[PDB]
Amino acid sequence: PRLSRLEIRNLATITQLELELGGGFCAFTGETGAGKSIIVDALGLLLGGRANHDLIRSGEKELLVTGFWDSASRRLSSAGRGAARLSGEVVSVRELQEWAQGRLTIHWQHSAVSLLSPANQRGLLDRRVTKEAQAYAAAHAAWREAVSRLERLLVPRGSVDALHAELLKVGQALDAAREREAEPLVDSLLAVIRELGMPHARMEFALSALAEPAAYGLSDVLLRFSANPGEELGPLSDVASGGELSRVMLAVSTVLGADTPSVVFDEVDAGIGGAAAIAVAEQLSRLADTRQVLVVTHLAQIAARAHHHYKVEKQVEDGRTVSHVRLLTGDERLEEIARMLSGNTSEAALEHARELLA
């Protein structure tokens, strides 16, 4: 159920943009900043993101972003208001978020409600030990019944104390499974991450013991990461580069899978190149075997692996240079790839382009 169509009106450098985009790996090249507005900035609004009025075109009163998979829309008004819609129905932004978060994932900018959320960091590990986790859940639920009944009432509490013993007993079994399955899981992620321009990345799952039992266990499960050799581990939110976060999100996404039909990465080509850039294009390609991945890129290595190569271009319209997008046919695409390497076609550029595409 990919994002089939995208309509943007009066957003930044875009007067009117109707984009039929679909498939697996979609690459946006050309005017990269413009591409970001389409893919990161615009789609961000559909996700129920901030109401950034800076996004409204320079001399315009209001912008509109419609997306078709079912439709969702976000309208920002220079007045100070706006509106969200789900299939033509004025809904609340909170509902737009809950709905769109089942369809879209934008990385770096919106990893917070995806994999970096406290609930999902834990989920990563807990879906490797479902048996133990379900064992806890059952124990915890049964214990809540005992506590409930006991509250409904010198008075015996014999059952609730036995159940609480199981709860801790089982709860500890869970932590043991967690720590057990953590290393192999961290190892599989690092295997990929270290090929994406972070050869000395370190990563671990940390269990934090809770004061009281949670519905999800006896401990908090946190994901800690350091990109460089000299650095100390820490939250993934503490990576110095947005691009680095994106590339770590990519790795996790291909290794363990994405949870939405469409995923967006911004800047995953940021601070890398050469070998590192090829490894990224390869991971993107694989994630696209099951998903629609939308990236804006300036590296021919990445573009050449796209199922669809879009070029963001510039045209004058009412004396103003606006943005325009269009699919690349094949030979036109080959030309673009060469331009991205050599900045203009050179028999060798075409020869390098030929290989990148194949």
UniProtKB/Swiss-Prot annotation:
Offer a single GO CC term for the protein.
bacterial nucleoid
What keywords appear on the UniProt entry? Answer: ATP-binding, DNA damage, DNA repair, Nucleotide-binding
Q: What's the encoding gene here?
A: recN
GO terms assigned for molecular function: ATP binding; identical protein binding
Q: Which family does it belong to?
A: Belongs to the RecN family.
SUPFAM superfamilies per the UniProt record, alphabetical: P-loop containing nucleoside triphosphate hydrolases
Lineage, top-rank taxon, reads: Bacteria
Q: Which organism is it from?
A: Deinococcus radiodurans (strain ATCC 13939 / DSM 20539 / JCM 16871 / CCUG 27074 / LMG 4051 / NBRC 15346 / NCIMB 9279 / VKM B-1422 / R1)
Q: Tell me the Gene Ontology biological-process terms attached to this UniProt entry.
A: DNA recombination; DNA repair; SOS response
One Pfam assignment: SMC_N
NCBIfam families membership: recN
How is this protein named in the record? DNA repair protein RecN
Q: Does the keyword Methyltransferase apply?
A: no
